[PDB]
Amino acid sequence: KSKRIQDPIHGLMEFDNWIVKFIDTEHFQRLRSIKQLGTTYYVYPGASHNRFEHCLGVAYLAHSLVKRIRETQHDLGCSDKDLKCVTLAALCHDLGHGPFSHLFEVFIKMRRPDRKWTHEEASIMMFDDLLKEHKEIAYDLDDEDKLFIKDLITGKKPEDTGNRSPYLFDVVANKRNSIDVDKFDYLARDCYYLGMKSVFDFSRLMNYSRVSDDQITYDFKESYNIYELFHTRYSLHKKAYNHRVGKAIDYMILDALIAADPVLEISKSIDKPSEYLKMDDTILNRIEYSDSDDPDLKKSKEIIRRIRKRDLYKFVDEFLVPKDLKGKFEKDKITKIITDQLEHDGLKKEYVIVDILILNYGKKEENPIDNVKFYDKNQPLKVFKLESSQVSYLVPELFEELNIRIFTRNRDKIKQIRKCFKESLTKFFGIPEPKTYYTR
Amino acid sequence: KSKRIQDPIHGLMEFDNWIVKFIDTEHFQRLRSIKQLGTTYYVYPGASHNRFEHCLGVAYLAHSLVKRIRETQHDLGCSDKDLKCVTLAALCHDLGHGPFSHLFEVFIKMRRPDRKWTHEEASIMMFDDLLKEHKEIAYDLDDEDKLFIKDLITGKKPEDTGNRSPYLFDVVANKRNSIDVDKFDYLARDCYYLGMKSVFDFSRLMNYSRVSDDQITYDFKESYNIYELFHTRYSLHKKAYNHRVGKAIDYMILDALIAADPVLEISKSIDKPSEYLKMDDTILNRIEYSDSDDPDLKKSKEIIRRIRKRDLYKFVDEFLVPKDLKGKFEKDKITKIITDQLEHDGLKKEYVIVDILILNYGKKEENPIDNVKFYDKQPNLKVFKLESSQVSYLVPELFEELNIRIFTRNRDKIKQIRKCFKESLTKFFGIPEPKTYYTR
Amino acid sequence: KSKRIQDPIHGLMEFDNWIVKFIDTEHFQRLRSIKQLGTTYYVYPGASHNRFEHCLGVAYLAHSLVKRIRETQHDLGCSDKDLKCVTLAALCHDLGHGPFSHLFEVFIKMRRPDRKWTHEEASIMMFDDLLKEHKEIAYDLDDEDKLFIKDLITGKKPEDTGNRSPYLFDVVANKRNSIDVDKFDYLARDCYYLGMKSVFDFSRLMNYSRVSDDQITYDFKESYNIYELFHTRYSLHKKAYNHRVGKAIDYMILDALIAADPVLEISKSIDKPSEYLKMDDTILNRIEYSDSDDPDLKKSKEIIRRIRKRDLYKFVDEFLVPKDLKGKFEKDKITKIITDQLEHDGLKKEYVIVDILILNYGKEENPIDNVKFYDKNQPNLKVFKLESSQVSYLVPELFEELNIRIFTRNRDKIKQIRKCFKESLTKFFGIPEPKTYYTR
């Protein structure tokens, strides 16, 4: 009946036999071969964790959070089916992730930019395919139930929630608060495995929440803890997720996948669920260990061998554009002028890689503790909202960061591309003195 | 002939006999009876630690850091005597702390305002008496070495450093960076004992620093870690150090010390070292259990019995002043108006307590990382200071935050003076509807 | 009403309003000044915790355990009244501890050996006085319920459990198994504060237990966890509790209390609860800082100054008896021949101290004795006992250890007393060569 999974983050998690059925499926077990942080493992060797174990924690969190809500608020009318759908939604929210997680999206964009593929779109396809091949374990699931699970995976804004337990949309994919149990898991899981520390305490948000006004409301004593949630995500982005060598290795993995695409048809595995079953991170080993004499795979094997020998794409120069010049930036425009500068004075454009780095705290430029409602235990008083002049705390110095990083495929000539970077910056942005991150 | 002391933060601490004899002085062992966090133990039962164990950690960190500097930079001319002086400075930096730690500094502030007594001065007096009664253990120290220890304890600004190893002044009492091993210990110690998490890693700061420009410079990779030093301290202030009930219990202690002062001469103990040797946290127990029928001591026991019954001074409300009204504030000027407001409607002044809270991200109002010089293991020309864009992270919204907190010695008139605080706020130099802490 | 208290081991413990009424009493608040490990703080600086916080954890653990039992086994009939009794028993079990915890028990044994006093008896008396002094609290409990609480504080053998929830006797003071939530707290709290590690995990024993056969049964997969409970207690005794310098300072505190006993009536405070409320660890400070001219206070003050100066009683030698000579041992007899040996061939007998050390793993019982198990894998309701032939794990080399440790009050001579010990061993025991620990 009930199962028990030992996890370093959540301890011992209990899953009912109903949950276990969807777990013991080739669709979900596929997540064991998909790394949670992609190429971070190649810079932070502790980041070996996969999306499989992360999804178990989100399902455990969502099930127990909704179970606490149902039992403490019996007048809410939340049914057993509502608890089952939110548990399946949490369990299958990352089912559609591809090899190296978000990097597969960039790969498919570079290959088929018109398909507009995204990982949670594949989550819908994989969820349906699991229900088709294992309809026995989903006998109790209705057609309106099946769409409920899919709508919770993607999340809905507070205006288009409907009448099917609107607070349940705050659990897995939060569009109003961005405070969800999925973030509770990976923030702590990645912190644990990267060997990093965090102040945010998700257990207090797990137990000291409540449902009011069709939304999950939190104790007003937890306001600074909610601050530390997005602070942990901000710090994780600034310390590990956006590491420069990790991005250089990311572009090498892309060039390898592109080269091996015509023979293996990697960018086509997303068209069929049967083909997506076999797509995971082991594709890198398949290319590496391929003995074929195809010039595509030979180029792809060379890039993979370059990873193993640490002969990676080197960094050239970085530039943070000021907020005053943010309006003039354009990814396609800045790429053309830079490549023209290499073509005019320099070498081939094949060497240079123009990378864009967008760091957004919260939702765009929105402050923390926005659209979240608070309560007081003493006053059993309507939900309230704290004003900007009522609470102060730590804040990101720059809410929106625009960084134009330059990588070179060839490690021979870096100083010439570094000079060419300043030449392109002074005539696109007009700044006579481009204050690049490598100042003089 | 050394001694290894086991500690939950630093593991096995190694102490040689030259300082062990200093640790085995009744002057140092007095710190066993002075809690590190004063009255925080009454709200956080885990905060049981005292200043004695903290000072052992600081002495351990100062000795190991300076020993590494001596073993890695032989050209600095740092002697074994210089190792002794900075180690002794660390051990005795908190020697002059009184009962309930900083609570005693504000007790003497009322009783003897002209004295302007600080625990840094008592540390000098206590250190002097230590050498007076234990001159057998200070035979190799001259007055120059003695005066060096005094200066290291008080800390000196970079300009007033002299040529007696100016870099050593950054070790125990940093007046330039605020990055000292004292902060290293108690931040890790308080987090461990309070049960709160920290984002700071002091071991990295200990192992990745070098001496240059007559100061302590840090690796560029530790820039984020330096931010998390003050992040951790800020969060600790916002959650534990400045707890409202902690200050409520504080004001009770001050009142009880005031009533017992004409009988016990508590405020006079800071004048003679042999009188100060008998002054610690236990004076509350001595007053509580004393059976004398003195009228001045009767009120002290009544206040102390109020603590045991948790019939404490009740928090009423607090007001976070806006940035625009900071210059419009004056502590003594505003206290007049709430005194006049209470005698109009309500009761007498004896029930209200006005409290000022100054929360500082680092000493005073400045970003402390702007005073840290860094080095990049691509050897830069000289040690450099981080520019505006070289690094961006979590900055405080208000570097200096002023909070007007209102406490009452009567628990029944919580709403009569909650109004009078708002009427005083709205009538003093403010706004039609003040937004205090409990306004919604 | 309900209050939550942060604890570094249990996180956030919630106490109902009826529990807070007991906490907010001078009887219970007295435990704030009763160190959990007595003089261990003088060897392990991290052991600054008190009996106050330990008691909160036992109450939280006991309450949470028995409440989960009723919510999962409704057929048991465990009423809300029984939940109240076992929670109070856990909260007040250590209410009778005196200064330095168990050390005070040895002190009263040496002073009034005919009283046969124990802190449990003082815990009942402190519980009776608490109710007498607070008539407004604890209205639900009747006289029969008051007897139940006292019986749970002392514990009862399975033959005298009665007919009112006999399983509840396993929660606080377990006599048939010794597996209780009291050990769950201090094993973890002492490890945390001493800076030690343990394999035992009380949380697994908390949520995976079942009540049957009028007792508390456990999952048979936790049989090795039960092994590690008693392993952790055995390891804590062998590493911290029984430290040789800890016992040396123990005798110093005892000698000082003896001198001051006629004046201060320390050993007589266990007769009147009103006198016992002022009996806490700060009594050492009142003696140390006394200005009285009585000769015993000077003798008491001189010993305390020896503690601060670290001129402690020096450990001379220690001898472990073999199993075949255990029966030929008697504390009074071996002390006499050692005393007579010092008197004839040596110095004054006041120098030598003869200390017995008994270390029992659990008598000589096996750690899985008398605990019944249920199989969660196969759905079952019957309990079973694991035979010794179907389990194998770690086990102490010596289940019972008897050591004769000798300390001297005079550190001028040691080798002389050490020689008298060896000659007394050959005269009291038939061995010609003494297998002491200071052989070489």
Added chain:
Amino acid sequence: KSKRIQDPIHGLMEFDNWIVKFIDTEHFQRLRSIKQLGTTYYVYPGASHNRFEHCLGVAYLAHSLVKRIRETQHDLGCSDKDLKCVTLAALCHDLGHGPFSHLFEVFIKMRRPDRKWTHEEASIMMFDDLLKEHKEIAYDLDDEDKLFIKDLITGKKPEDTGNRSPYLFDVVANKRNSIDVDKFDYLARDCYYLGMKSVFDFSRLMNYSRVSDDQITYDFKESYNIYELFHTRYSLHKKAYNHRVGKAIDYMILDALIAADPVLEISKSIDKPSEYLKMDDTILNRIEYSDSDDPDLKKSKEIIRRIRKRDLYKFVDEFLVPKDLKGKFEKDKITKIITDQLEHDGLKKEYVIVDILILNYGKKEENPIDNVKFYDKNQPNLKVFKLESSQVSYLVPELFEELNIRIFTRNRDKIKQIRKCFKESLTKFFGIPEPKTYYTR
């Protein structure tokens, strides 16, 4: 030059540039695709770590320890070459590990028992190939240094260590104490990743040791800490390393490997370095993601399919032999009685699996604390001594060598039936009329 690598166990690890060139070889980076705990990840999802990160820590600890010895005991004569040699042994001590670690040894033994191939032999084979294909990075090593490095990986008894710094054999593969920095790392790394606790503190063992009598001696105050090293490893075996379902999936992987061997020739990979370079855990995916219709491949594909659907081999029962009955026991002889009993009154023997579990507190039935020499800081004149019941009392295993007979079934419908045959064959093998198995109540 030097590089700093962040690790959750050791924090920041520094590596000199010469060590980095070995790390950045395809032979070392292959360990990124080999799980440290084999199939344990299928039971404990936190145990996702690979041999690459574990070997990084071991080389870091081995370098730190030996570097300290050279700086605190100049008179020993430990050369830079010696420090280079032991660090390389630590980095390559797991170089020849096959897919799912210890599982591959059983696959070679089952397929080719005459070879008796061990991953130390493959470690030798892949270490020689590492230097052959990267000769520019090993220019300073001579033939004797290579023999020094190779022997440090295996380890040597105290009677077989020469005069070339014999204490260094205690750093990576300790044959006298079993106290090496290999255990220092994976004991902590496995606990951190499985989500389990440990009483051992390897930091104390790293700094409170001293070399004398051609060995590594430990401070007297660390005697309890040493006991907890083997306490932690013993506890890790009883809950994680020897999990029944982990062993059940171990046999599933084996059956699928034998079934796929005629087509993929997996067992031949242990012969040529170039082929073993492609040998890692990913072969589980290549077999299940192939598309050929070979009947041998179809049999292995089904086994992998039952892994994903948790239609695994079911644990039947376990029998701990008594100490008296341990002398009268033989693996091949007891197995015949069980198959004969199942072929008599049951179904075919293809469903039953006979597994013999051997748990050692040390290496065999010796106590490793009896082979470590201790010293005293307050008595430096006193020669290093062994523990001789003088303050030597702690927790020891009841059986220093635990022998367990476990039965697995390939079909879950015959669990109760095979359970009877296990007790039947137990009665006709041992002189025990009523055997008390694991599931007997």
